Design a protein around this nucleic acid. Structure first.
Ligand SMILES: [Mg+2]
Ligand SMILES: [Mg+2]
Ligand SMILES: [Mg+2]
Ligand SMILES: [Mg+2]
Ligand SMILES: [Mg+2]
Ligand SMILES: [Mg+2]
Ligand SMILES: [Mg+2]
Ligand SMILES: [Mg+2]
Ligand SMILES: [Mg+2]
Ligand SMILES: [Mg+2]
Ligand SMILES: [Mg+2]
Ligand SMILES: [Mg+2]
Ligand SMILES: [Mg+2]
Ligand SMILES: [Mg+2]
Ligand SMILES: [Mg+2]
Ligand SMILES: [Mg+2]
Ligand SMILES: [Mg+2]
Ligand SMILES: [Mg+2]
Ligand SMILES: [Mg+2]
Ligand SMILES: [Mg+2]
Ligand SMILES: [Mg+2]
Ligand SMILES: [Mg+2]
Ligand SMILES: [Mg+2]
Ligand SMILES: [Mg+2]
Ligand SMILES: [Mg+2]
Ligand SMILES: [Mg+2]
Ligand SMILES: [Mg+2]
Ligand SMILES: [Mg+2]
Ligand SMILES: [Mg+2]
Ligand SMILES: [Mg+2]
Lengths: 59, 135, 50, 53, 122, 86, 134, 158
RNA sequence: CGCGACCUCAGAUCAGACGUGGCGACCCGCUGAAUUUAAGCAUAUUAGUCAGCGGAGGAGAAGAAACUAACCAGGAUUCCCUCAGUAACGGCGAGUGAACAGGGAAGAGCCCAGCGCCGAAUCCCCGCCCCGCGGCGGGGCGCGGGACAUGUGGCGUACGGAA
RNA sequence: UAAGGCUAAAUACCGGCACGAGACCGAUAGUCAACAAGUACCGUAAGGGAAAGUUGAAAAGAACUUUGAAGAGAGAGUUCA
RNA sequence: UACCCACCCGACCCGUCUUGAAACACGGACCAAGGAGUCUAACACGUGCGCGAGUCGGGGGCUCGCACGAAAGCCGCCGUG
RNA sequence: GGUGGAGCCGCCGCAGGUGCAGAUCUUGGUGGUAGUAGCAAAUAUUCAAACGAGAACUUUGAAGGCCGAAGUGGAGAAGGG
RNA sequence: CGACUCUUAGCGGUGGAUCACUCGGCUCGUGCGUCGAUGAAGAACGCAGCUAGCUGCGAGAAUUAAUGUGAAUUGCAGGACACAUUGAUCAUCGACACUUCGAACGCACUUGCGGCCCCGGGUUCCUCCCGGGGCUACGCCUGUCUGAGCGUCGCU
C-alpha cells in the first residue's frame, strides 16, 4: 500500500482491517524517495492475499 | 546622564564628534519612565505622571495608565478618547506632558523651530524648493 | 548522507519530481512559448539548495 | 521631472496675439493661404444668424 | 446525475454522511482503476466524484453552522468562529453606542443653542 | 596550501534551512538565522539595502489572508448575508 | 469623440483587454450580424454567435451563398468553426478553417428560452431609444 | 572661480535640494479639488452665506499698515453686550466670535457694532420647525429668498 | 490561642477582555557620520541628513497664547504666496541663515484638576423577563455581586462662574 | 496666564488597491524583469544576480516516392509569398 | 564621376599628450550596435517682443465630466509685493 | 534595378536623451594566429568469437600484465544525493 | 587557364544590426486609503485524467455553495448532460473551508517528548493500551476563588 504520510501503523492496521474486511498480522512502513509512505501489510495465515487482491481489483 | 555607547573612547571621526562622558539625553527622565511603563503594559494606554521620590542614583516616577477597554471608559465620554487607535502609545511618539517638553513646542519667539507641526516638519518645509509649475 | 532528517528527505522528494521533462502534449497548447524545461538539475553540476 | 516644462506670456502680449489672429481671419489672402478652401464662400468675416446656436 | 446542492439542502444530516461515505468508497476504487489501466471513462469520473464529495460536505458544514449560529443567536457569550470577522482595527472600533453617546453637559448645549438655518441680505 | 588543497576538507555545515525564512541560513552553532534572525521575535528587515527588502515584502508571496481583504473592502466588508435567491 | 473618463481609449490597454478577456465576455465580442430577413422580422441588428446557428460566409477566401451550420467556437483562438467551411490537409484529413463572427452573417438563429428573451430585450431597447428620440 | 564682474552668489544648494523637490503638477487638479469643496459646502448648507459667518472690521497693526482694514478673526465680546447678542447664540447665528480682543476705543467699537446692527436687520432667521413661534422671520420674508451670499458677507472696503 | 476587619502582597489552565509581528511613501520620538565642502586643515558645512533605532493613521503632528505686538493695534493650528534669501552666524569665511506685519486656502472650537455647591446625584460586574441582535444595545425587575468616603455623578472653569 | 487635556478642515503621500493620461522609452532602450524575473546561476552568508520578444493570416507545420544505419537530402506538397 | 587593371609623379599610421611624433612614447586585431557638456537656481551682458513711471505673477479666486484640458479665458484681484 | 512586405515622407513652425574611429570606452559577434598549441604521470597489451549498418574503444572466451592485503581488496561518516 | 593571393564583382552562409510592430516599462494626474492571535505578513509541502514551470488553490486542495451570466469546454481524451435545464463556461462573490512552519502558542525544535479534559475499541475506569475530540505560550486590565504577612488594628 501507498499510505498517507502522517499515518501510524495502528492507523494503517485499523484502516486495512476496516475496509477489506480483513485482519492484519503486522504493518511495516517506509518512505519512498518521493515522500510516498509505503506500508506492506502481512495478513493473518487463515486469510489470503491472492484472493483479496482480486476483490480490491488489483492484479 | 548619557554616555556615548562605543567601544572604549573610539568615537571615530572628527574631534567635535569626539566625546562620550559628559553628554546628555534629549528627552527627560520622567518621559523615559512613562516610556517603559507604557511599554510593559502594551495593552494599556499611557496618560501622564507625578513624581514620588528621589535618590542620588535613581528617580521614582509613578505613572498613570488606563485600560482603553474597561466599559467604565468606552461608555463614559471624555475618557473615551484614549480608546481611539490614534493614541496608541502616546508616550513613544512624545505626546505626554513630559514627553512633549522635549520636542520644544509652544507659541512665540522661541517655539520657532517647531513652527510647522514639529521640529522635523519645520525644516521639511524650509529645506525644500517650491519649484512651481509655472515659474 | 544515509542519515537524513525528514525535512531534508521531503526536500529531495520534491526536487526529484521537479526534474521530469515536459509532457509533449504541452507543446500543442494554443499559445505556447515553452519547448524544453529549462530549470533542470543534474547531481554533478549545480548542487542543490544545500 | 523638475524641467521647466511650462512657460509664460504677458496678458497684453497674448491678447494682441489674438488681435493679430482675428484681424487675419479676414483678408482672404492669408486665410486661403492656409489651404482653407474658401472660394465659393460669400464673404469672409462670415457672419451667420443666431438661429445656429 | 450530479449530486446537486438542490437535493441535499433539505435532507437529514445522517443521510448525507451515508452518501458521502458512498462516494468516499467509490473514489478509493477509482484510484485503484487509475493504477490498473482502467479506462478514460473511469479516469474522468475521479474528478466528478472528488468534487461531488465537496458538493456533499459543503452542505453538511453549511447546515450545521446555520443551525449552530441559531443556538447562540440571542446568547451573549458566543464562540469565535461565529463572532463577526471584519478586521482587527474594525472589531476594536467603538461600539456604535460609544461614539453617539454625548456627555450630559454637551446635550444641555445642543438644546439651548442649536444652529438655525438662514440666508441673509434680504 | 590555502587553495585547492584546502578547497578540499569542506565536509561540515554552518548553514541549514530556516523554519521562518525558508532560506539556507540557520547557523547551527549560533542558532540565529541571519537572514531574518530567528529567536529574535522581529524580522531583520533593514532600510539598508532596499534591494533585499523588495525580495520579501507583502506582494512577493501569496497574500492568502491579504489578497481577499482588499476584495472584501472594495465592495464593503459585509457578512452573514447571502444574495437574494431564485 | 469619447468622453466618459472611467473608459480607456488607449492603443495598448484595450489591445490587452482583448487576448486577456475571459470567456464570459468573449460571447459579446464574438457576435455576428443577422441577415436582412431576420433583421427585419426581429428588430435586432447583431447577435452573439452560438454552436448550432446557421451562417453565411461574407468575406474571406471562400465567401459564398452556401448556408453552413456552425460546428464549434474557439473562444480561445477566439474564432468559429463551420461546416463545408474546410480545407484538405496533406494526408486527406479535412480540417475546418477559422472565421470570425464579424466576417459572417446569421441566416437562422437557433432559438431557445434564454436566447428569445435577449431578442425581446434588444428589440425593446432599440424601440425605447426611438420612442425616447420621438 | 569667479571671472571679471558678477555678484558673489551664495546659492544654497550644498545640502540636498534634489531629494526634497516639490513640483507642482497638482496645482490645477488641486484648483479643482478645492472647487468641489467651495461648491459642495454651499449646496449642503443651502440657505447660508456661502463665504462663511459675519466677521468684523478691524485695523492692521504695524505702523506702515495702519491705514488698512480687514476682516478680523471674530467680533469681540465687549462688542456684543452693546449689540444685545448672547455670545453662545452669535456662534449659531453665523456671527464670528473671537473672545480674545482688547477693545481700546469707542471709534472702532461702534463702527464694528453697526455691523451687527446691520446684520440683524438683513437676516432671515429660518425657523426651528415649519410651525414655529417668535423671532423667526415671516413666511413672506422667507419665500422671497433662497439666496446664498456669494462673496464675503458685507464685504469690508477701505 | 482563636476568630474578624482592613493594608500590602501572592497564586489560580478561574470569568471575561486585551497586548505582542508585519507593512512601512507620507507620519511622530531619538540617534546620528563620514565622504563631502572650505582649493589643507581640525573651526565650520554635508547636517539633525543615512544607516541605526524607536512609534502611529487614512492621513500623521499641533491647536484654542504664559502668543503676537508697539498699531489709531491683532487674535488657536496647518498650508500656499509673501517677507525673502532679508534681521544675525561664521579661521564674519564656506556657508549658513529665520522670523514679525499683508493676502489667500481653510477655517470651530472646546474640554479637565482644584474652590464649592448638590443623602455618590455615580460607576462597574451578575440573575429573570420585555424589545434589539452580521459594528452587543436599550427597557424594566430583582437585600444578586463589587468600586467609591484616600471620593464616584450634575453645574462649572476663568471669554467668568457660582450663589 | 503655564505645571492637566481633545479636535475636523484645508495639509503630506517613490508603500497598497483602483484608475486616467503623455512633446516618453521603445526590447544592448525602457524598471533587474514585454517572456519560467527577482526567474536561471553564483557565494557558506550578508548578499549578488543574468541572458532571452516577432513563422504565417491558417499549422494549411513536407502526406507520399525515393536515396540514405541514422543525421541529412531529391522529387513532391503546402503556401500571395 | 564609380570597378578592375595599367602606367608616370607624389607618399610614414591614425588619435593623443606634446618646445618637438612615422616614433625604438602610449590607445588602437576587425565589425556591428550603445557612448560623453545634460537639467535646475542664481547672477551677468548681449539680443527679441509687450506695456511704459510701470510693469508684472503668483499664489490665490471666478469659469469642467477636459476629448482637445491637467489647456484657455477672465478678477476693485492687479496689488497685499 | 531587386526584396521587402506596412506604413511613409516635402515645406512652415515648434520639441529633443541629436550625428563616433579614439576613451586597456559598454554589449554581442568575428577573424588572423590555425587547422596552429596540444590529447606525455601509474612498465601492457594480443588473439579469437559475439553483438552489431558501423568495432582498436562494448561483451565472452583464451593468452599476456599490473594493484598486490600499509591494495586499485571488502564495508561505513561527513559530504554527496 | 597550372596552385596561392588581392581587388572587385555574380551568387551559398554567419551573424544577428537596421527597419517595422508591441498584452512591458517610465513619467504625470485622480479616487479611495485594505493586517493580526477569531490568529497576519512571510515560508514549507502538496493538489490536474493525462502536468515539469509559471500561475490558482488547500486533504473539501487547478476549488467549495450562491447570483448573474448565460453554451461551451478543449493539446488530447473523457464525460454528464436531457442546452424547456443554479443549465456547460466565466465573473462575481456573500454561502462553507484554512495541509505544515511563522508574532507560531504545552516544551522543544529531533520532528521528540508530554500534561490535563472528553467520545469510539479496550476497559466495561482496570489501567493501561489502541482509537477519537477540547485545552496547555508570555504580558497585562476588570472581576472571582484560594492564600501569606511579629503591616495596622478590632474582638477575645
Ligand atoms: Mg563535484
Ligand atoms: Mg463636566
Ligand atoms: Mg474663505
Ligand atoms: Mg507596530
Ligand atoms: Mg581639492
Ligand atoms: Mg578640503
Ligand atoms: Mg584631505
Ligand atoms: Mg566639522
Ligand atoms: Mg547641524
Ligand atoms: Mg544648518
Ligand atoms: Mg534613516
Ligand atoms: Mg500666527
Ligand atoms: Mg495649554
Ligand atoms: Mg493632541
Ligand atoms: Mg490628531
Ligand atoms: Mg534583445
Ligand atoms: Mg532590457
Ligand atoms: Mg529575428
Ligand atoms: Mg529582430
Ligand atoms: Mg516573401
Ligand atoms: Mg601633462
Ligand atoms: Mg626613436
Ligand atoms: Mg600614458
Ligand atoms: Mg527624446
Ligand atoms: Mg552610434
Ligand atoms: Mg610496482
Ligand atoms: Mg562496495
Ligand atoms: Mg538580440
Ligand atoms: Mg533587434
Ligand atoms: Mg497577619
Amino acid at each position: 500500500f501507498i499510505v498517507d504520510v502522517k499515518a501510524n501503523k495502528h492507523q494503517i492496521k485499523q484502516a486495512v482491517k476496516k475496509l477489506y474486511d480483513i485482519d492484519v498480522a503486522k504493518v511495516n512502513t517506509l518512505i519512498r524517495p518521493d515522500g510516498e509512505k509505503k506500508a506492506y501489510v502481512r495478513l493473518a495465515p487463515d486469510y489470503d492475499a491472492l484472493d483479496v487482491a482480486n476483490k480490491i481489483g488489483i492484479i | 546622564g548619557r554616555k556615548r555607547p562605543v567601544p572604549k573612547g573610539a568615537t571615530y571621526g572628527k574631534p567635535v564628534h569626539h566625546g562620550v562622558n559628559q553628554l546628555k539625553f534629549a528627552r527627560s527622565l520622567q518621559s523615559v519612565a512613562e516610556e517603559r511603563a507604557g511599554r510593559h503594559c502594551g495593552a494599556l494606554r499611557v496618560l501622564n505622571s507625578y513624581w514620588v521620590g528621589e535618590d542620588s542614583t535613581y528617580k521614582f516616577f509613578e505613572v498613570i495608565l488606563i485600560d482603553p477597554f474597561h466599559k467604565a471608559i468606552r461608555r463614559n465620554p471624555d475618557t473615551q478618547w484614549i480608546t481611539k487607535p490614534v493614541h496608541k502609545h502616546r508616550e513613544m511618539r512624545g505626546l505626554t506632558s513630559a514627553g512633549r517638553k522635549s520636542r520644544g513646542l509652544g507659541k512665540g519667539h522661541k517655539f520657532h523651530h517647531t513652527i510647522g507641526g514639529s521640529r522635523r516638519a519645520a525644516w521639511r518645509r524650509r529645506n525644500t524648493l517650491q519649484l512651481h509649475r509655472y515659474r | 548522507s544515509s542519515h537524513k532528517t525528514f525535512r531534508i528527505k521531503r526536500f529531495l522528494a520534491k526536487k526529484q519530481k521537479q526534474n521530469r521533462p515536459i509532457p509533449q502534449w504541452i507543446r500543442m497548447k494554443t499559445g505556447n512559448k515553452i519547448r524544453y524545461n529549462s530549470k533542470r538539475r543534474h547531481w554533478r553540476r549545480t548542487k542543490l539548495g544545500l | 521631472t523638475w524641467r521647466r516644462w511650462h512657460r509664460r506670456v504677458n496678458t497684453t502680449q497674448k491678447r494682441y496675439a489674438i488681435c493679430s489672429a482675428l484681424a487675419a481671419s479676414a483678408l482672404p489672402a492669408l486665410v486661403m493661404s492656409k489651404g482653407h478652401r474658401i472660394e465659393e464662400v460669400p464673404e469672409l468675416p462670415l457672419v451667420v444668424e443666431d438661429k445656429v446656436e | 446525475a450530479k449530486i446537486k446542492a438542490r437535493d441535499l439542502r433539505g435532507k437529514k444530516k445522517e443521510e448525507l454522511l451515508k452518501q458521502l461515505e458512498d462516494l468516499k468508497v467509490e473514489l478509493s476504487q477509482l484510484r485503484v482503476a487509475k493504477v490498473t489501466g482502467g479506462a478514460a471513462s473511469k479516469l474522468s469520473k475521479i474528478r466528478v466524484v472528488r468534487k461531488s464529495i465537496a458538493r456533499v460536505l459543503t452542505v453538511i458544514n453549511q447546515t450545521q453552522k446555520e443551525n449552530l449560529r441559531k443556538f447562540y443567536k440571542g446568547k451573549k457569550y458566543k464562540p469565535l468562529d461565529l463572532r463577526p470577522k471584519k478586521t482587527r482595527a474594525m472589531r476594536r472600533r467603538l461600539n456604535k453606542h460609544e461614539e453617539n453617546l454625548k456627555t450630559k453637559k454637551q446635550q444641555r448645549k445642543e438644546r439651548l443653542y442649536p444652529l438655525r438655518k438662514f440666508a441673509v441680505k434680504a | 596550501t590555502k587553495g585547492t588543497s584546502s578547497f578540499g576538507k569542506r565536509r561540515n555545515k554552518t548553514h541549514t534551512l530556516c523554519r521562518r525564512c525558508g532560506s539556507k541560513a540557520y547557523h547551527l552553532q549560533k542558532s540565529t538565522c541571519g537572514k531574518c534572525g530567528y529567536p529574535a521575535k522581529r524580522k531583520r528587515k533593514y532600510n539598508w539595502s532596499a534591494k533585499a527588502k523588495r525580495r520579501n515584502t507583502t506582494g512577493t508571496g501569496r497574500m492568502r489572508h491579504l489578497k481577499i481583504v482588499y476584495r472584501r473592502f472594495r465592495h464593503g466588508f459585509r457578512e452573514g448575508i447571502t444574495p437574494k435567491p431564485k | 469623440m469619447k468622453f466618459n473618463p472611467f473608459v480607456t481609449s488607449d492603443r495598448s490597454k484595450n489591445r490587452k483587454r482583448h487576448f486577456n478577456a475571459p470567456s464570459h465576455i468573449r460571447r459579446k465580442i464574438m457576435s455576428s450580424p443577422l441577415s436582412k430577413e431576420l433583421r427585419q422580422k426581429y428588430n435586432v441588428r447583431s447577435m452573439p454567435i452560438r454552436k448550432d446557428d446557421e451562417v453565411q460566409v461574407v468575406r474571406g477566401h471562400y465567401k459564398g451563398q452556401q448556408i453552413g451550420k456552425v460546428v464549434q467556437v474557439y473562444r480561445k483562438k477566439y474564432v468559429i468553426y463551420i461546416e463545408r467551411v474546410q480545407r484538405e490537409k496533406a494526408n486527406g484529413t479535412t480540417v475546418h478553417v477559422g472565421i470570425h463572427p464579424s466576417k459572417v452573417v446569421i441566416t437562422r438563429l437557433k432559438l431557445d428560452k434564454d436566447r428569445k428573451k435577449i431578442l425581446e430585450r434588444k428589440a425593446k431597447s432599440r424601440q425605447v431609444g426611438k420612442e425616447k428620440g420621438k | 572661480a569667479p571671472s571679471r564682474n558678477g555678484m558673489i552668489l551664495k546659492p544654497h544648494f550644498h545640502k540636498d535640494w534634489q531629494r526634497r523637490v516639490a513640483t507642482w503638477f497638482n496645482q490645477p487638479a488641486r484648483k479643482i479639488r478645492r472647487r468641489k469643496a467651495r461648491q459642495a459646502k454651499a449646496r449642503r448648507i443651502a440657505p447660508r452665506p456661502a463665504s462663511g459667518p459675519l466677521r468684523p472690521v478691524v485695523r492692521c497693526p504695524t505702523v506702515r499698515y495702519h491705514t488698512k482694514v480687514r476682516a478680523g478673526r471674530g467680533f469681540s465680546l465687549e462688542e456684543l453686550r452693546v449689540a444685545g447678542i448672547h455670545k453662545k447664540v452669535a456662534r449659531t447665528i453665523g456671527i464670528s466670535v473671537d473672545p480674545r480682543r482688547r477693545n481700546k476705543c469707542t471709534e472702532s467699537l461702534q463702527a464694528n457694532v453697526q455691523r451687527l446692527k446691520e446684520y440683524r436687520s438683513k437676516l432671515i432667521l429660518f425657523p426651528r420647525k415649519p410651525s414655529a413661534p417668535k423671532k423667526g422671520d415671516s413666511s413672506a420674508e422667507e419665500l422671497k429668498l433662497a439666496t446664498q451670499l456669494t462673496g464675503p458677507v458685507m464685504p469690508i472696503r477701505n
